[PDB]
Amino acid sequence: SSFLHIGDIVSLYAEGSVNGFISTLGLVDDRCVVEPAAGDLDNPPKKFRDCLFKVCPMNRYSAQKQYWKAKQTDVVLLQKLQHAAQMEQKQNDTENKKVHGDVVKYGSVIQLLHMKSNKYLTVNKRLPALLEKNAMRVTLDATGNEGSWLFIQPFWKLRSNGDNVVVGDKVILNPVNAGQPLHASNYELSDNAGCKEVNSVNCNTSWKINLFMQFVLKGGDVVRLFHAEQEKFLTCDEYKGKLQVFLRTTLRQSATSATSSNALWEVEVVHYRFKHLATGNYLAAEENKYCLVAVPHGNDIASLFELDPT
Amino acid sequence: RDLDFANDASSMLASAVEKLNEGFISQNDRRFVIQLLEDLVFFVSDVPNNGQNVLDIMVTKPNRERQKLMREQNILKQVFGILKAPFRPLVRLEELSDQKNAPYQHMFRLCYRVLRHSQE
Amino acid sequence: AIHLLDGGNTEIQKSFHNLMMSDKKSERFFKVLHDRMKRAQQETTSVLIMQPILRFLQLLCENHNRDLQNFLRCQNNKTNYNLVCETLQFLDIGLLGLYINEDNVGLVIQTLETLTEYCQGPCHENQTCIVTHESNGIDIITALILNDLVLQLKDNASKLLLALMESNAERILISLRPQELVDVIKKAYLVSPREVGHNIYILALQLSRHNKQLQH
Amino acid sequence: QQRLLKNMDAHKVMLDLLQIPYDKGDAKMMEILRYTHQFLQKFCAGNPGNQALLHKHLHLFLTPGLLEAETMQHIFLNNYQLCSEISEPVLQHFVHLLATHGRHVQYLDFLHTVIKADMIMTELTNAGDDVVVFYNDKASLAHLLDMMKAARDGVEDHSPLMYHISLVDLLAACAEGKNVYTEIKCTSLLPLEDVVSVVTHEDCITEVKMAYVNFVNHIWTLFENFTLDMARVCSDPTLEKYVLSVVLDTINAFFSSPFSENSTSLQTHQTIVVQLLQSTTRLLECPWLQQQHKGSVEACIRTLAMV
């Protein structure tokens, strides 16, 4: 429990009227719902990166709002409006950079943006909900019009107003502009398997942001294994039309700068297990005397590998 | 995040290429293709998603790792395959700008712009 | 029994001790205490009986009357009905600022005072019992110090922890972070808060006698 | 009026008349005693002072009889403090009177009223099956079926079916909370399989079905019975309210609360939890879908059709 420094990866495994992890299908899917069966707060599910939520300062889009209104509907003042909008955008970027690491001042106004969406989660003020009969729409906006960010309501109601919110403390997404805080879509979603959208209404449950990990060492994290023997890392390539694991012979002098994107490896624990994040398969070894290969997944017991202490 | 986005984009592009080479894509399919193209353009440019015109991308320096991944991850191959299939004959390049094939022309232009950005 | 001991009258304390030693009803007496002292731990009007019970126990152990303290810890009886452990755990029964309010502050002050009078005299066994207890109560005392009547709670917790180290410091230091201790001391400088801060400062010196970083 | 009567102290005269010798054998004496008991009950209204005054002379009013039982029941109808301090001797006397006389609805009703304001449940467990008898045996099942057939026109309100209903109500009241002892005793005396066989049976009556549901490999198969009992009224004066009053709530808890550590199960669960509330979709949005029915509509169109 510590002050929620702005900018840290966040996540709200809601445990109100229902329990589930709040996220979206990703890509262009314009809907934010929960996945009760996907995972648990105490039992995090796979694809942990899907929960990446960066905390950013409230967006300022006054000149941006004026420019949008002008675009919707003069020409002479358009250049001045564009210049003012550019200045406002620069100011907004500066403000967002300033709050980096800022403690969660109970009652302060911030926003949470999904890394996959790379946009601020906002609520459609004058828009009905996609499914709920008597609710409003909400999606992820690329930039936002000051409605992207909302207030943090101390659902615990213990931390002092303005106090640095303890990470994991009971909080709710109080609607700054709408006034109706986040409400779990109890609707029995059929189109989306295990779907429970988030609306802007007056409810009695919410979720609290949880800080992510800024990665006898780190466990379930995706890192790269560089073989000091070869002074490089063992990546995977589509050689001869088939996936093959080999040490890349990079023609770049800077060995440490060889971020080929094929060095994606995930580590698991049991009582490590290596998963080839480059192709989504799992590494393994077989006969040649022996050679390394990739299989669909590490579920097979044969996928075991040994890490030796320095 | 960029790697995950690239993997998702590769899967979506493979599906879209298969659908296009197979048969027509409904209005929902066309909208999905347009959204995929927009997401790819945004990721490649790396610039904030402002109200700038789609074919108005001007960045200082693209993400070298992102560009390398896109080239290796068949993203460029995906764009090339989309371009090849759209002509083969799915589109004759003559009935464009006739108020009927406008979405296809817009998608082709977006793909070309994304390829050019990747060629930065 | 509470008005018979007002001011810690020693003679009536001795009379209670002699009655409980001689009269065979001892094991039953403590029962109706322990039973009523185990009717609020599980519950969390019983609290309005707990408060008199704790005032009464403190009065029996008042004035450093060690023999009563041992009789209230072990009793040298066939079956022992411990009450220092029970009151410690009941006190155990910073996610507490919402659970100590205008209806549970007098009771907690009574509980801390009771835990003090049991071992304020150098009753080594009872201090060991309070510290070597598997209920974290030693941790809740720290939480009380760190996290108007709040001033009284802080002062009583400081007095209890001072009592715990007469003739333990390492165990206490595990809970309270010395930097936070100095922070609360400085904040208390602004019952008046200056003396509460001063008592916390005396506790800090006593701890520093067995620590180095505090000395800095 | 009660204050004026208390000032007049007519309660003492009424008590004396009740205790006055009757010389049983004349219908006039019985009618007078019944009228006196009714008047005393009327004077035993919610006023806690009057209730305490009446209870003071409990010995005279604590006698084996229908009028006496009714007066005793009305004495502590809502007195929380008075009912809480009920001495175990009263419960023992009631149990002994029920055992001696046998099947009397008045004693069961008085016990049920007293229960709702542990000892009663313990005594009933000690009482065995003489009074609180579970018709779970196969021969008991045939007897229950015969009784239900005899109740085609209606429930006698005093026959064995009424006694069983009263016993079930008393058991539920004793274990209405989370009482481990009472719940365990009720489960021992109320096997789930018997409830599944009877309540789900076609001959099961609406009152009996409601009693069984309120009293309640069982929750994974009782969902089908509940669904069969959903559109019973839709497919009366109080038909629907017997089931929907509880049927959704606990089920929603089973779908939400951790008491059911089978959140995913066979098609009877993995599919019923996604189809059952659908058959109540019309019920959920029905023209009568207001209040508790509306609440279950919200809990079903939302949740009971999600699992």
Q: Do B51 and A26 touch (CB under 8 A)?
A: no
The residue among A203, A195, A36 whose CA lies nearest residue D302 is A195
d(CA A12, CA A113): 12
**Contacts with C97 from chain A: Cβ below 8 Å:** 158
Q: Exposed e or buried b for every residue in A26-56, given b needs 16+ CB within 10 A?
A: bbbebbbbbbbebbebeebeeebebbbbbbb
Determination technique used: cryo-EM
Residues 6 or more apart in contact with residue C103 via CB below 8 angstroms:
none
Residues D93 and D62 sit within 8 Å (Cβ to Cβ):
yes
As a dihedral over the C-alpha atoms of residue D93, residue D94, residue D97, residue D102, rounded to 10 degrees, the angle is -150
d(CA A147, CA A126): 12
d(CA A136, CA A178): 10
Query: Could you tell me the two tokens for C109?
Result: 């002050």
Residues 6 or more apart in contact with residue A61 via CB below 8 angstroms:
A88, A92, A143, A144, A145, A146
CA-nearest residue to A195 within chain D is: D306
The residue among D94, D113, D92, D114 whose CA lies nearest residue D104 is D94
Q: Is C40 known as a binding-site position?
A: no
Residues B45 and B59 sit within 8 Å (Cβ to Cβ):
yes
| Cβ-based neighbour number of residue C36 at 10 Å | 14
The residue among B114, B102, B101, B109 whose CA lies nearest residue B39 is B114
User: Which of B42, B49, B68 is nearest residue A261 as measured by Cβ atoms?
Assistant: B68
Chains near B with 3+ CB pairs less than 8 A apart are A
The residue among A24, A188, C104 whose CA lies nearest residue D256 is A188
Whether A264 and chain B come into contact, CB under 8 Å, resolves to yes
Which alpha helices (H) appear in C83-147, and where do they start and end?
Answer: 84-92, 105-119, 124-131, 137-146
The amino acid sitting at A50 is D
The amino acid sitting at C154 is K
**Contacts with C95 from chain A: Cβ below 8 Å:** 158
Q: Do B8 and A26 touch (CB under 8 A)?
A: yes
Query: Could you tell me the two tokens for A228?
Result: 């000091």
The residue among A171, A176, A172, A165 whose CA lies nearest residue A106 is A165
Residues 6 or more apart in contact with residue B58 via CB below 8 angstroms:
B47
The residue among D89, D49, D198, D74 whose CA lies nearest residue D136 is D198
The residue among C99, C102, C104 whose CA lies nearest residue C143 is C99
Helix (H) or strand (E) holding A50: none
Three-class secondary structure of residue A32 per DSSP: coil
Please name the residue that has the structure tokens 């729409």. Answer: A137
Three-class secondary structure of residue A126 per DSSP: strand
What distance separates the 2 farthest-apart alpha carbons in chain C? Answer: 57
Q: Write the DSSP symbol of residue D303.
A: I
Residues B41 and B52 sit within 8 Å (Cβ to Cβ):
no
Please name the residue that has the structure tokens 């700008």. Answer: B97
Q: How far is CA C76 from CA C16, C69, C125, in A?
A: 16, 12, 14
Q: Write the DSSP symbol of residue A123.
A: E
Three-class secondary structure of residue C11 per DSSP: helix
Cα-atom radius of gyration of chain A, to the nearest Å? 23
State residue B19 phi and psi, 5-degree precision.
-60, -45
Query: Could you tell me the two tokens for A301?
Result: 């017991």
Calculate how close chain C gets to A159, using CA atoms only, in Å.
9
- E runs forming strands in D113-172: none
Residues 6 or more apart in contact with residue D215 via CB below 8 angstroms:
D168, D171, D172, D186, D190, D195
The residue among D104, D39, D50 whose CA lies nearest residue D77 is D50
Q: Note the resolution in Å, 1 decimal.
A: 3.7
Region for A39 from its dihedrals, namely left if φ exceeds 0, alpha if ψ lies in -120 to 50, beta otherwise? beta
| Cβ-based neighbour number of residue D248 at 10 Å | 28
Calculate how close chain A gets to B94, using CA atoms only, in Å.
31
Calculate how close chain C gets to A244, using CA atoms only, in Å.
53
Query: Could you tell me the two tokens for A291?
Result: 């050679």
Helix (H) or strand (E) holding A19: strand A19-23
Please name the residue that has the structure tokens 């509880």. Answer: D246
Q: State whether the Cα torsion A120-A122-A127-A133 is positive or negative.
A: positive
Angle at B63 between CA B58 and CA B67, to 5 degrees: 100
| Cβ-based neighbour number of residue C51 at 10 Å | 15
Query: Between chain A and chain C, how many beta carbons pairs sit less than 8 Å apart?
Result: 6
d(CA A104, CA A148): 17
The amino acid sitting at C50 is M
d(CA D211, CA D188): 17
**Contacts with D256 from chain A: Cβ below 8 Å:** 17-18
Region for B107 from its dihedrals, namely left if φ exceeds 0, alpha if ψ lies in -120 to 50, beta otherwise? alpha
Q: Do A18 and D256 touch (CB under 8 A)?
A: yes
Chains near A with 3+ CB pairs less than 8 A apart are B, C, D
Query: Could you tell me the two tokens for B80?
Result: 């090339």
**Contacts with C94 from chain A: Cβ below 8 Å:** 1
Calculate how close chain C gets to A187, using CA atoms only, in Å.
34
Q: Do C95 and A158 touch (CB under 8 A)?
A: yes
User: Which of D256, D264, D305 is nearest residue A188 as measured by Cβ atoms?
Assistant: D305
Query: Could you tell me the two tokens for A258?
Result: 């060889």
d(CA C210, CA D93): 69
Q: How far is CA A89 from CA A47, B58, D33, in A?
A: 33, 17, 92
Q: State whether the Cα torsion D153-D159-D164-D165 is positive or negative.
A: positive
CATH architecture of A2-200: Trefoil (2.80)
Q: Do B49 and A118 touch (CB under 8 A)?
A: yes
Whether A192 and chain D come into contact, CB under 8 Å, resolves to no
Please name the residue that has the structure tokens 């109100």. Answer: A16
- Spatial strand order of the sheet with A196-200 comes to A13-15, A19-23, A33-35, A196-200, A182-184
Query: Could you tell me the two tokens for A83?
Result: 């210049």
| Cβ-based neighbour number of residue A207 at 10 Å | 25
Q: How far is CA A32 from CA A43, A52, A136, in A?
A: 21, 14, 13
Query: Could you tell me the two tokens for D25?
Result: 């054998």
Query: Could you tell me the two tokens for A106?
Result: 């109970």
Calculate how close chain A gets to D175, using CA atoms only, in Å.
26
Residues D139 and D194 sit within 8 Å (Cβ to Cβ):
no
Q: What is the DSSP string of A211-269?
A: ---------S-EE--EETTTTEEEEEEEETTEEEEEE-----S-GGG---S---EEEE-
